[PDB]
């Protein structure tokens, strides 16, 4: 809500690289661009957008953006085939494009080369690998087991999916969590915990410290984690995730993307900056110099960056992986899957028993509105309006 354009991007993303692109826009156009990194901008943008005041451009995962679309402007691209078709699919909601894809942020297997010259290509190796490394005085493999984003790549490897896709749509009723592939995947992860190869309590924070310290041989993470391994003076490399039962681990992949706020009047100015400054081999490089994006949506600079085994490995994990659906019911997937996994590790429920639960919990509507007394049928509450109600609340 002004005559210059304001950009919001996360603190781990290297805003100073973006700033130098904005300064080049200023030398060429005169328009001043300021890039901010608010503490909880992902949650903050919806609250402020509803008032009709928020930044002109916002940079997040494509997945959050699907919810913004059910508060965000259609971009118009024509000869913008500089980006891959699969990256464009990330930013498409009801056949409309919500944003400009930037980076492909797929999980990978990262490994200390001095602790392990050649990483294991299979999951089944890691137990045997851990005994050899445990004797030396270190671990094999530490990553976040709390959040299902990191456990899922193993789980969906031998089959099993959030929501089946048919006739160009997602089917919120058809969930692939209580099938054999899911069970085999999960049971292998539980067994690794049962055999003291991994600890249920370990989280992202704990795992990050150990790999950066050099206490663990391998971790699992995105290119968001690369700058911290760099600073930690640890000889590391990024490879393909280990296969499970000869099938590749299929991580859900997030795409860093640039959307425009409907309440931004600077849409024409913002579009020029994204289309003709950000999505440029030099533009993207300025960012990557500050903090790496891994694989990028632009083909120009991706063909350059993929000479690095890290970026080449990232894209590989993204291809064998599937792109993260942006549909709302994914909230209820992640919730269903996080509780299933955590309780399998806890030994609260059996694997077969937790995934049974998950298959139900994932497909359940967030809210069902059944009528008691009908309304006028005309007037509906609109964002920024105060609702006056009576209510009775109780547990089901």
């Amino acid at each position: 809500e002004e005559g210059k354009l304001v950009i919001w991007i996360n603190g781990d993303k290297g805003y100073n690289g973006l700033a130098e692109v904005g300064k080049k826009f200023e030398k060429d156009t005169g328009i001043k661009v300021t890039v901010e990194h608010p503490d909880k901008l992902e949650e903050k943008f919806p609250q402020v957008a509803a008032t009709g005041d928020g930044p002109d451009i916002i940079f997040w995962a494509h997945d959050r953006f699907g919810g913004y679309a059910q508060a965000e402007i259609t971009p118009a691209a024509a000869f913008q085939d500089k980006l891959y078709p699969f990256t464009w699919d990330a930013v498409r909601y009801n056949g409309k494009l919500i944003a400009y894809p930037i980076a492909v942020e797929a999980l990978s297997l990262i490994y200390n080369k001095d602790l392990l010259p050649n990483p294991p290509k299979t999951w089944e190796e890691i137990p045997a690998l851990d005994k050899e490394l445990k004797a030396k005085g270190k671990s094999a493999l530490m990553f976040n087991l709390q959040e299902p984003y990191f456990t899922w790549p193993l789980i969906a490897a031998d089959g099993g999916y959030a929501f089946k896709y048919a006739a160009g749509k997602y089917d919120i009723k058809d969930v692939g969590v209580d099938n054999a592939g899911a069970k085999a995947g999960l049971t292998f992860l539980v067994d690794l915990i049962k055999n003291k190869h991994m600890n249920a309590d370990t989280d992202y924070s704990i795992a990050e410290a150990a790999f950066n310290k050099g206490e663990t041989a391998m971790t699992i993470n995105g290119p968001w984690a690369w700058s911290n391994i760099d600073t930690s003076a640890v000889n590391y490399g990024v490879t393909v995730l280990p296969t499970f039962k000869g099938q590749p681990s299929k991580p859900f992949v997030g795409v860093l993307s640039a959307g425009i706020n409907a309440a931004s009047p600077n849409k024409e100015l913002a579009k020029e900056f994204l289309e003709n400054y950000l999505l440029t081999d030099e533009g993207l490089e300025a960012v990557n110099k500050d903090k790496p994006l891994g694989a990028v949506a632009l083909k120009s600079y991706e063909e350059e960056l993929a000479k690095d085994p890290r970026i080449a490995a990232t894209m590989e994990n993204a291809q064998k992986g599937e792109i993260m659906p942006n549909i709302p019911q994914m909230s209820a997937f992640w919730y269903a899957v996080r509780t299933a996994v955590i309780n399998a590790a806890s030994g609260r429920q059996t694997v077969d028993e937790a995934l049974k639960d998950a298959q139900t919990n994932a497909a359940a509507m967030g809210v069902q509105v059944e009528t008691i007394s009908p309304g006028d049928g005309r007037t509906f509450p609109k964002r920024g309006q105060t609702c006056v109600v009576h209510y009775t609340g109780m547990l089901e």
Binding site: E43, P46, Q47, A50, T51, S331, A332, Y335, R338, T339, N361, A364, M365, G366, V367, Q368, V369, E370, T371, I372, S373, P374, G375, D376, G377, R378, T379, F380, P381, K382, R383, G384, Q385, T386, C387, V388, V389, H390, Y391, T392, G393, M394, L395, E396
Partner: protein, 75 residues
């Protein structure tokens, strides 16, 4: 199932700004679907309520909530 709150008890209506995330996800998507004067059963899942944390001391983790809501007036 046990009752944790009622406005009709206190006999003062409850006012919230839609889309400001003052209330749970189930209320924002849910009351947005009600016409003015309408009364409806909101069956909210934990994801759209307080999820795995719950509300400390009042609502357990993984608790599906049921709300009897009557949309009285817009302001």
């Amino acid at each position: 199932g046990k009752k944790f709150d009622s406005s009709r008890d206190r006999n003062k209506p409850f006012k919230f700004m839609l889309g400001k995330q003052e209330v749970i996800r189930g209320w924002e998507e849910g009351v947005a679907q009600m016409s003015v004067g309408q009364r409806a059963k909101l069956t909210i899942s934990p994801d759209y309520a307080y999820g795995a944390t719950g509300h400390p001391g009042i609502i357990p983790p993984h608790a599906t909530l049921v709300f009897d809501v009557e949309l009285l007036k817009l302001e």
